[PDB]
A paper describes a structure:
Members of the ring-forming [name]/ClpB family of ATP-driven molecular chaperones are the principle protein disaggregases in fungi ([name]), plants (Hsp101), and eubacteria (ClpB). At the molecular level, [name] [name] forms a homo-hexamer that is stabilized by adenine nucleotides. Each [name] monomer features two ATP-binding domains, termed AAA-1 and AAA-2, in addition to an N-terminal (N) domain and a coiled-coil motif that mediates the physical interaction with Hsp70. It is now widely accepted that [name] facilitates the unfolding of aggregated proteins and the threading of substrate through the protein translocation channel analogous to ATP-dependent Clp proteases.
Here we present the orthorhombic crystal structure of an N-terminal fragment of [name] [name] (Hsp1041-360) comprising the N domain (residues 4–164), the AAA-1large domain (residues 165–341), and the first α-helix of the AAA-1small domain (residues 345–356). We did not observe any unaccounted electron density that could be attributed to a bound nucleotide, even when 5 mM nucleotide (ADPNP or ADP) was added for crystallization, indicating that Hsp1041-360 was crystallized in the nucleotide-free state. The crystal structure consists of three Hsp1041-360 monomers (mol 1, mol 2, and mol 3) that are structurally independent and in different physicochemical environments, which allows the identification of common structural features that may be of functional importance. Superimposing the crystal structures of the complete Hsp1041-360 fragment through their AAA-1large domain shows that the orientation of the N domain seen in mol 1 and mol 2 is rotated by 172–174° relative to that in mol 3 with residues 161–165 making up the hinge region. In our structure, Tyr257 makes contact with the N domain of a neighboring, non-crystallographic symmetry (NCS) related molecule. In addition, the aliphatic side chain of Lys256 forms a stacking interaction with the Tyr257 side chain, which may orient Tyr257, while the ε-amino group of Lys256 makes an ionic interaction with the Glu146 side chain of a neighboring molecule. In our structure, loop-2 adopts two distinct conformations in an ‘up’ and ‘down’ configuration when viewed along the six-fold axis of the [name] hexamer. Residue 292 (asparagine) that is non-conserved in ClpA/B proteins, is in van der Waals contact with the N domain of an NCS-related, neighboring molecule (Lys131), resembling an interaction with substrate.
Author numbering: 6 to 343
The structure:
């Protein structure tokens, strides 16, 4: 059985073949599936690998597409897509590779490596001036010692869940999408000092929801980019948790928790510091909601999760009363009306 992501690649591969007028599914359709631009703004598994190796990805897409239109299109298109000879070899090759790595499932990793054995794929790569061997090293670099023992272990990038369910504010500040903050110099400076602490290094902005707490977070993100922060915060990423994105699409039981776990995992296992801002932390922390709290609280206790919280005075006092460990983990910062 394939992974969730690998199955998606295969499904999209034949979907592309169906979009075109090709009767047979070929290896190039899988390659085209890998470079397919997702609508969720995620970074495709193969895109990351190619542009991580300092290769030209735009050129690569052009070659693949010009090779996908090069093959004849059947005007009397039949309602049946049978796998070609080359494809069958690839799929079988992917099963061999996953068994050699003692993986539990056939991931997009194995499929990619199987494509590298195909003649047409190799010719495409050589035509796109992209060295397959260098790409192989990237994939090995990405996965590392991580075994595919689950149907969702073959994540595309180390920031897949963060890119889907959170907003990179540091990137937004760098891209010039954030308006400059005015009159919050003290709150901004206080939030930064706390983040740079050793003990109780998690800021929690306290105030009425009718105030601009997110402005402070934007200010902090801008300071980080300009290196106007202590050395420990330099080069850090500041993400804002998007609760709306988390629940959107989550139609099954346990779907929310899986997405939340995926986000926290990418943060805790990140080589570079990542700060997570949670606008309504009491909706995920307070005694009223212990479902998502059983995910966030253990993560915070492991000490590899730096979080900027935001809540009201009444709600803050509520979480404190229910759990006295919150006071030792979070440093309250009052935000008043300017």
């Amino acid at each position: 059985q394939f992974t969730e992501r690998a199955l998606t690649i295969l499904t999209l591969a034949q979907k592309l073949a169906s979009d075109h007028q090709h009767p047979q599914l070929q290896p190039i359709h899988i390659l085209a599936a890998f470079i397919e631009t997702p609508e969720d703004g995620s970074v495709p598994y193969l895109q990351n690998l190619i542009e991580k190796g300092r290769y030209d990805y735009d050129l690569f897409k052009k070659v693949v597409n010009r090779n996908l239109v090069r093959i004849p299109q059947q005007q009397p298109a039949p309602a049946e897509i049978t796998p070609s000879y080359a494809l069958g070899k690839v799929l079988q090759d992917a099963a061999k590779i996953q068994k050699q790595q003692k993986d539990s499932f056939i991931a997009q990793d194995h499929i990619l490596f199987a494509l590298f054995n195909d003649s047409s794929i190799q010719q495409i790569f050589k035509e796109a001036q992209v060295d397959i061997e260098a790409i192989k090293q990237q994939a090995l670099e990405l996965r590392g010692n991580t075994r595919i023992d689950s149907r969702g272990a073959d994540t595309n990038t180390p920031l897949e869940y963060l890119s889907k369910y959170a907003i990179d504010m540091t990137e937004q500040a760098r891209q010039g999408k954030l308006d400059p903050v005015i009159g919050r110099e003290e709150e901004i400076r206080s939030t930064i000092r706390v983040l740079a602490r050793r003990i109780k290094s998690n800021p929690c902005l306290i105030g009425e929801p009718g105030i601009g707490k997110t402005a402070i977070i934007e200010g902090v993100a801008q300071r980080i980019i300009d290196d106007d922060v202590p050395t420990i915060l330099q080069g850090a990423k500041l993400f804002s948790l998007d609760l709306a994105a988390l629940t959107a699409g989550a139609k099954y039981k346990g779907d929310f928790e899986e997405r939340f776990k995926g986000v926290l995992k990418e943060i805790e296992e990140s080589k570079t510091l990542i700060v997570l801002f949670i606008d309504e932390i009491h909706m995920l922390m307070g005694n009223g909601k212990d479902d998502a709290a059983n995910i966030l609280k253990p993560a915070l206790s492991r000490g590899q999760l730096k979080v900027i919280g935001a809540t009201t005075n009444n709600e803050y006092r509520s979480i404190v009363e229910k759990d006295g460990a919150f006071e030792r983990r979070f440093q309250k910062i009052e935000v008043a009306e300017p």
